[PDB]
């Protein structure tokens, strides 16, 4: 049924033996397997005959323009019912995109197409869009070397499509005018988009005005990623009335590194109190400070806030904010995941968090406190938390200055049958050989537990 090989360089003898499986399997994935144009002849011909294949993935292989041609020819066949196609990171340039329109026309079964990490350029994109002009559902074009010029052709696709559910154009330099053209296309569209990603696309505060309308007009929208753009509080302020729209039932909102301060956070808190559908939010990498943390904690105690995951890594929080998080954590019964990594909370701050989570009736399942200036002194509290918590299942302590004495303390609790932690995360923590064998033992003793590093 499924052939799936990852990060594995295949010999010629082995390649010959694999060919009949490519000829008849339903799912074929050969990711990072050292494939080149030479072997693409073989692949195209094999795919020519496969009447079962519904998914093909050939990501991270130097196929090149010639290689992709040989593969894609293979797909044009009255037997081909491919639903999912991925050629991510395959060295496909604009010169290789000539066949895309014909190929997309041959494949009415095609639902998902991944072409990220290929330098299609604006000229390559235009060719692809000729194909998309009228049942594709998901389209991913991250890092495709696109500029604003690519956005008029995509806007045309959007105007016409009724089936598109996911669009990902993250990590392209489309900028203000590009995004504006995209939003007009989408505004005049009948499609019911579920996922829209514009991470690192050069968005400005002005684009938030265009997006405000989109968010209100796409009732079906579930996932919006605008991370890593210079939005500013002025941007977010123009976006929020759209997020407050009764038609908006967004589930996931990514606003990391969006140049936000406490002011924008304050506007956003209005959404958090009013919108029960909102389950996952990232505000990571914005300078919100202890003030920001306080506002967030207040919203998390309001009845309309049903947030289940809050990502606020690198937000400039200190120990001074931790009392607020503690209060929120003892009262809130919805929040399952809290990411506090890369905030200088210190031993004192995390200590306050430990007392909160020890209490019975608390619900938090996942806590990240990596890179929080922790020392071996915090491991008394953390070890105590591991016996006391009713809900904690995953704890991330990565990238702290812990050593043998602290880890040895954590080990004491992890050994206990009363401790039901599923994951302890210890990336980049140095413990010595002596401690490691003890650590290995606990691991073998408790199969329900993973210690990750």
């Amino acid at each position: 049924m499924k052939l799936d090989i990852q990060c594995e360089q295949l010999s010629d003898a082995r390649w010959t033996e694999l060919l009949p499986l490519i000829q008849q399997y339903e799912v074929v994935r050969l990711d990072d397997c050292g494939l080149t144009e030479v072997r693409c002849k073989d692949i195209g011909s094999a795919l020519q005959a496969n009447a079962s294949l519904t998914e093909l993935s050939l990501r991270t292989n130097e196929l090149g323009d010639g290689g992709v041609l040989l593969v894609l020819q293979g797909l044009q066949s009255p037997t081909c019912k491919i639903q999912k196609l991925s050629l991510q990171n395959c060295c496909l340039t604009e010169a290789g995109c000539g066949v895309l329109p014909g190929v997309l026309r041959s494949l009415p079964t095609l639902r998902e197409l991944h072409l990220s990490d290929n330098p299609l350029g604006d000229a390559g994109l235009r060719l692809l869009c000729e194909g998309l002009l009228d049942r594709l559902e998901k389209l991913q074009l991250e890092y495709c070397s696109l500029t604003a010029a690519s956005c008029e052709p995509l806007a045309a696709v959007l105007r016409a499509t009724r089936d598109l559910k996911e669009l990902v154009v993250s990590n392209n330099d489309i900028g203000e005018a590009g995004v504006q053209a995209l939003c007009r296309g989408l505004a005049e569209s009948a499609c019911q988009l579920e996922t829209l990603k514009l991470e690192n696309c050069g968005l400005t505060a002005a684009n938030c005005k265009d997006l405000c309308g989109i968010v209100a007009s796409q009732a079906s929208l579930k996932d919006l990623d605008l991370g890593s753009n210079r939005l500013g509080d002025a941007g977010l302020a123009e976006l929020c009335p759209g997020l407050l729209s009764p038609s908006s039932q967004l589930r996931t909102l990514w606003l990391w590194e969006c140049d936000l301060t406490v002011s924008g956070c304050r506007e956003l808190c209005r959404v958090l109190q009013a919108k029960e559908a909102l389950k996952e939010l990232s505000l990571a990498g914005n300078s919100l400070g202890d003030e920001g943390a306080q506002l967030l904690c207040e919203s998390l105690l309001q009845p309309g806030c049903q947030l289940e995951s809050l990502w606020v890594k690198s937000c400039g929080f200190t120990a001074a904010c931790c009392q607020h998080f503690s209060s929120m954590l003892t009262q809130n019964k919805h929040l399952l995941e809290l990411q506090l990594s890369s905030n200088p909370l210190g031993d004192a701050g995390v200590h306050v968090l430990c007392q909160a989570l020890g209490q019975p009736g608390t619900v938090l399942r996942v806590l990240w406190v990596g890179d929080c200036e922790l020392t071996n002194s915090s491991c008394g509290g953390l070890a105590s938390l591991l016996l006391a918590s009713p809900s904690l299942r995953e704890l991330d302590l990565s990238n702290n200055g812990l050593g043998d004495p602290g880890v040895l303390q954590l080990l004491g609790s992890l050994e206990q049958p009363a401790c039901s932690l599923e994951q302890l995360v210890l990336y980049d923590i140095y413990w010595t050989e002596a401690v490691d064998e003890r650590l290995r033992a606990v691991e073998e003793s408790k199969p329900g537990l993973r210690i990750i590093s």
Binding site: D117, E199, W311, K313, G370, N399, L402, Q423, E433, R450
Partner: protein, 124 residues
């Protein structure tokens, strides 16, 4: 069983390239070295020097590890490194990394016989 020395090589050595060749390096390398198994490793540094030169650091400038142990060592010269860092949109099992090439001094802890690096502590 993977010893600390071998784990160090898997997680932090890339002697076969002189520098990251593209902005997709970390996505490729974090996946192939198994650093995206079960979780996305938040940050990771690969050293683009020979194994021999990285091992020699164990007899260079002695410094305190971040955790207070005394068996850490700073390379006298800068080394070609690549910093891999989870982006904010990275979410297991769809991890995503920013690639940053640099030339920095490395700091490692050394342990055992022979006395070899067993931990990547920092770059400066």
């Amino acid at each position: 069983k993977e010893t600390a020395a071998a784990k160090f090589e898997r997680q932090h050595m890339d002697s076969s390239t002189s520098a990251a060749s593209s902005s997709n390096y970390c996505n490729q390398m974090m996946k192939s070295r198994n650093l995206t198994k079960d979780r996305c490793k938040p940050v990771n540094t690969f050293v683009h020097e020979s194994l021999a030169d990285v091992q020699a650091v164990c007899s260079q400038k002695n410094v305190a590890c971040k955790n207070g142990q005394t068996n850490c060592y700073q390379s006298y010269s800068t080394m070609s490194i690549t910093d891999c860092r989870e982006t904010g949109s990275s979410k297991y099992p769809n991890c995503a990394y920013k690639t940053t090439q640099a030339n920095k001094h490395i700091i490692v802890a050394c342990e055992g016989n022979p006395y070899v690096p067993v931990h990547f502590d920092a770059s400066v």
